[PDB]
Point group: C2
């Protein structure tokens, strides 16, 4: 068909981002799910790197790296805007996205290997964001953006990460989580595997 | 407080040279504070929380690190001349090529400056295999000078210092692109004295 193909993980944190963005753009995509057990021959030629998900294929153009995909989707499908307009705000947005992947997505990898230092570090970091959400309903923005597409998959996996939010700042973050998860686009972007993380853990 | 942007650049740093090239291409003037691994200033220490804290651009209350972030900021805040394509598909390709240069080649250049002899050959084998694309276009997958060339110009300049010489077939196209790249007045203006000294002493 004349429709984009997405090679996605079933439980992958970065594949969930792309799926959330495609839902926010309202675009229909053919999703082929890939496991660590077996990575398809089609994807094997299209993606040269060990980590193969997410990969978006469209006509001639093949793209990997999740932020490259997310920025392409925002440039190809402008409505609704998931990035700010002015270059200063766009710089800050990109920088926050960089620091979320470097400081927190890395911690989560360790938390899946049951690191308790990383678990405490991520909880402390998440709770420190509380004074942002007393200013703006979303991350440093009045409107939902791509930075919220970094935080939403991460904060969804918080019971599975063994993280329970209490103390000062919990009320503010939990409200932000409500604004994030109650979105129809978020609920539609969930795989059954991703849905099973909440109601079991 | 000062009404001009401040770049915290390295003297021989690869990613600092990218940012310096882009600022030269945009024609915008900047107070450049040079930093060594020996000592990093109190100002820079407060704004950047990472071990490797160069390049760092500081503008009013906005601090930016990561070279690709800074380079994209500069292209968006200073539109003339455009160093990125207009259409979304071309922009995605450019970003992917910029991603692969840093993942595949810039990683080898880290290993060369340490010890590695294998990384020297791997970078040589990488560049010479990409030689047919330079026959197609005057710049890397582009008819005009883009940010992809801003990834290649710090790399190919240091090619005598890496110990890689133009070898066999394909190297005619590489050197012709290199001479097209290095003879830009923006490139020569972006070079530090340390970076100039790599050319003559190797």
């Amino acid at each position: 068909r004349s429709v984009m193909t997405l090679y996605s993980g079933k439980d992958d944190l970065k594949s969930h981002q792309v799926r959330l963005v495609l839902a926010e753009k309202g675009v229909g995509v053919e999703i082929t799910y890939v496991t660590d057990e077996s990575t398809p021959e089609d994807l094997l030629q299209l993606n040269p790197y060990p980590e193969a998900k997410p990969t978006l294929v469209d006509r001639e153009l093949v793209l990997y790296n999740a932020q490259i995909i997310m920025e392409y989707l925002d440039e190809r499908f402008p409505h609704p805007p998931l990035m700010p307009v002015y270059p200063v705000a766009r710089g800050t947005s990109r920088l926050m996205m960089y620091r979320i992947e470097r400081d927190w997505y890395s911690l989560a990898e360790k938390i899946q290997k049951n690191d308790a230092q990383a678990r405490q570090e991520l909880k402390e970091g998440i709770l420190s964001l509380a004074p942002i959400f007393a200013d703006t309903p979303y991350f440093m923005s009045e409107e939902f953006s791509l930075v919220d597409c970094y935080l939403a998959p991460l904060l969804w996996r918080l019971p599975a990460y063994g993280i329970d939010l209490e103390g000062q700042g919990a009320k503010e973050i939990k409200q932000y989580m409500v604004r994030l998860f109650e979105r129809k686009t978020f609920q539609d972007s969930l795989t059954e595997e991703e849905k099973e993380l909440a109601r079991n853990a």
